[PDB]
């Protein structure tokens, strides 16, 4: 308000003290908690001067205040961030990653995090200006916690967003991230885990690089972190890795992930966490017979069947895939074990749910079970498929009979196939 002219005059003067005083006043203004007057500061024409001040390497205090003011302008809308970009600040902030002033380096790290954070395009511009390697180079065994937090956050923004950055562009981050997840600091952990969650989201080559960075054992430890801020991205990353092939999935299983994931289903945790854990388990029971056996040995099937029967629909859906996948890849005895743990009833109950994908997955699971029952029938020269009796008793047979009315052709044909094979 009433100070503004002295402030604009200060930044436009050639006097070091007036520049520092004015820039400091603007920095304070831009640091107010709610609705900082970012637009007013831009309109007052001081941004290009702030950007010039970044290059004053004789005057680290002015560089710092100017960097903080610019960080805060770049924390606003996309249009606010675009003004910082248009005035050439990104390459200058990258250069400041090599400043001998610790405060300035940290501020430059923060500023670049805010720019990268705006969108995939701004992230790509930051990476294109070579920010990654100098960001990493000034990290080491001696780095202040305040710097570790800022750099890890910025790193996570360099990795964030769809479409994803090139894997070649973010690869140098993997070894730093693999070290950072050994911090005990929750903030560093939170951001490093988000970053790994982004880098592991994609094709099996991306997952391979993440695994080769050596993170699996520690990611699995962090499944037990008491803070949801850490647990959630750790769990997301673990989930991403087991979308990969059998050997990649085995790298997670080999570090007692399954007992950890089970404890997430049995603690009193938010629905979205349990849903994530069931999805992850589902991608594990989609694996080979040894991996199914590991899920069994961990004691997961009982809890999983209870969820399938009684949980909120979002969780039930993942439990369904999880049980159905196990019936698809499992051996005869593994399948009998799922039946002895009570899976038939809940699979039957879901034949009437409004989601056709789930109806199909339940039907397929029941079909796999029926085949097993029929093999037992043959081997005992028996009269009855025991599992078809069970499906009948769970009121699954009448539900299958009504699926002959279903719109969906795949469901219809499957139902007919099942009825003709086991009830003719």
């Amino acid at each position: 308000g009433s100070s503004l002219p002295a402030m604009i005059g200060g930044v436009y003067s050639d006097d070091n003290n007036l520049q520092l005083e004015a820039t400091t006043q603007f920095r304070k203004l831009l640091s107010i908690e709610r609705s900082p007057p970012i637009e007013e500061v831009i309109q007052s024409g001081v941004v290009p001067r702030f950007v010039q001040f970044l290059t004053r390497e004789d005057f680290p205090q002015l560089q710092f205040e100017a960097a903080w003011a610019l960080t805060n302008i770049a924390s606003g809308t996309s249009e606010n961030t675009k003004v910082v970009i248009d005035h050439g600040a990104v390459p200058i902030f990258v250069k400041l990653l090599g400043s001998s002033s610790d405060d300035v380096r940290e501020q430059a790290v923060w500023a670049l995090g805010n720019v990268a954070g705006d969108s995939p395009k701004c992230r790509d511009l930051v990476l294109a200006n070579g920010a990654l390697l100098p960001l990493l180079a000034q990290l080491n065994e001696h780095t202040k916690l305040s710097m570790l937090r800022n750099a890890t956050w910025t790193l996570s923004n360099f990795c964030r967003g769809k479409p994803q950055p090139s894997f070649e562009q973010t690869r140098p981050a993997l070894p730093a991230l693999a070290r950072l997840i050994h911090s005990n600091d929750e903030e560093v952990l939170t951001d490093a885990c988000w970053a790994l969650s982004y880098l592991s989201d994609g094709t099996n080559d991306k997952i391979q690089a993440v695994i080769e960075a050596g993170v699996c054992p520690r990611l699995v430890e962090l499944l037990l972190h008491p803070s949801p801020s850490v647990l959630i991205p750790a769990l997301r990353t673990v989930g991403n890795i087991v979308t990969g092939d059998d050997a990649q999935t085995q790298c997670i299983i080999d570090h007692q992930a399954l007992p950890c994931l089970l404890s997430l289903l049995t603690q009193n945790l938010k629905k979205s966490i349990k849903k994530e854990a069931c999805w992850t388990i589902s991608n594990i029971t989609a694996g080979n017979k040894d991996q199914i056996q590991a899920v069994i040995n961990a004691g997961i099937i009982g809890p999983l069947v209870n969820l399938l029967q009684t949980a909120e629909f979002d969780i039930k859906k993942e439990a369904a895939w999880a049980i159905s996948n196990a019936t698809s890849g499992g051996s005869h005895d593994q399948i009998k074990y799922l039946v002895s743990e009570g899976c038939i009833k809940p699979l039957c109950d879901l034949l009437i749910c409004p989601d056709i994908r789930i109806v199909t997955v339940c039907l397929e699971g029941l079909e796999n079970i029926l085949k097993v029952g029929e093999t037992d029938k043959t081997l005992a020269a028996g009269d009855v498929n025991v599992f078809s009796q069970m499906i009948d008793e769970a009121e699954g047979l009448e539900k299958i009979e009504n699926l002959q009315s279903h719109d969906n052709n795949e469901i219809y044909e499957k139902a007919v196939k099942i009825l003709e094979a086991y009830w003719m």
Binding site: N72, S75, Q107, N114, N240, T243, T285, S328
Partner: peptide, 14 residues
């Protein structure tokens, strides 16, 4: 069984 793939601004003022 079958593997199933995974089912904005992020800024900080100082």
């Amino acid at each position: 069984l079958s593997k199933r793939p995974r089912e904005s601004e992020r800024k900080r003022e100082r």
